[PDB]
């Protein structure tokens, strides 16, 4: 479990700062309200498709398991890589999604408690 | 738990304007995307006015573009399409299907993409 300060650092190194408008405090909210800073956490859905990595990327759009039917896969990568320690395909991706054009409404997690919150105190008092 | 249902509908010479409206039921919150599709006799059943429920973005085939406009209210969890200038093509069955999941902008007018649908309400030009 990555430390939140230490989450908001490695998002900063990853250029995901400064990205579509959105502050380090979005980023680092969504990740730990929808992998509770856990990059390895995995969860499926009701359809089938599964969810890999710390910001927990729907297989069924975005990344390519092979597992889920009529598969997208927009972020062109495997989902493995994903569910890999190392959130590095996670931003990448993640700056694909919030590229979409609806912002980072994508995630209902972003949505249900990131939006219109005090998402910058995520990255207070971290010495960054 | 979503179940769609449509309104409106009937004979509306052209240049007549039309409100179609639709509503969700249940879990409404779970709904992502919000489009019409019109099922038109002897074609597949295509979009007409996708629309994204949160930022209210709306995307319009090119056909009904400047002459469809499709809203949405959050707290009714409803969606009606206007229509105006209608012209003889228009004549076809209109679905309002929904989806629980953040379909991408270039899919947001696929009807596979979504996972919920509705008894389709016809709609014919005099």
């Known amino acids: 479990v990555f430390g939140r300060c230490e989450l908001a650092a490695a998002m900063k190194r990853h250029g995901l700062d400064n990205y579509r408008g959105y502050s380090l405090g979005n980023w680092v909210c969504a990740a730990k309200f929808e992998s509770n800073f856990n990059t390895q956490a995995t969860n499926r859905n009701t359809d089938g498709s599964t969810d890999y990595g710390i910001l927990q990327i729907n297989s069924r759009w975005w990344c390519n398991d092979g597992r889920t039917p009529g598969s997208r896969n927009l972020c062109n990568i495997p989902c493995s890589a994903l569910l890999s320690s190392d959130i590095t395909a996670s931003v990448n991706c993640a700056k694909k999604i919030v590229s979409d054009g609806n912002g980072m409404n994508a995630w209902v997690a972003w949505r249900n408690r990131c939006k219109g919150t005090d998402v910058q105190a995520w990255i207070r008092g971290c010495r960054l | 738990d979503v179940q769609l249902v449509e309104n409106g509908g009937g004979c509306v010479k052209a240049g007549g304007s039309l409100r179609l409206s639709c509503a969700a039921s249940?879990?409404?919150?779970?709904?992502?995307?919000m489009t019409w599709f019109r099922q038109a006799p002897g074609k597949a059943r295509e979009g007409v006015a996708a629309?994204?429920?949160?930022?209210?973005?709306?995307y319009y085939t090119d056909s009904v573009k400047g002459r469809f406009t499709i809203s949405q209210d959050k707290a009714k969890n409803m969606a009606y399409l206007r229509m105006d200038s209608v012209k003889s093509e228009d004549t076809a069955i209109y679905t309002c299907?929904?989806?629980?999941?953040?379909?991408?902008?270039?899919?947001?007018?696929?009807?596979?993409?979504?996972?919920?649908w509705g008894q389709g309400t016809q709609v014919m030009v005099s």
């Open positions: 299907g929904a989806t629980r999941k953040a379909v991408p902008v270039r899919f947001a007018l696929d009807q596979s993409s979504y996972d919920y």
């Open positions: 249940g879990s409404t919150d779970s709904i992502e995307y």
């Open positions: 629309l994204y429920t949160h930022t209210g973005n709306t």
